[PDB]
Amino acid sequence: GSKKPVPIIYCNRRTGKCQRM
Numbered sequence: 001g002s003k004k005p006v007p008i009i010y011c012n013r014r015t016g017k018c019q020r021m
Contacts, residue, residue: 004021
C-alpha cells in the first residue's frame with residue numbers, strides 16, 4: 001500500500017527479520 005498506520009508485523013528481507021513498523 002502507501003502507508004502503514006497500523007503497528008502490524010513486517011518482514012524485512014534486507015535484515016532477514018520481522019519487526020513492528
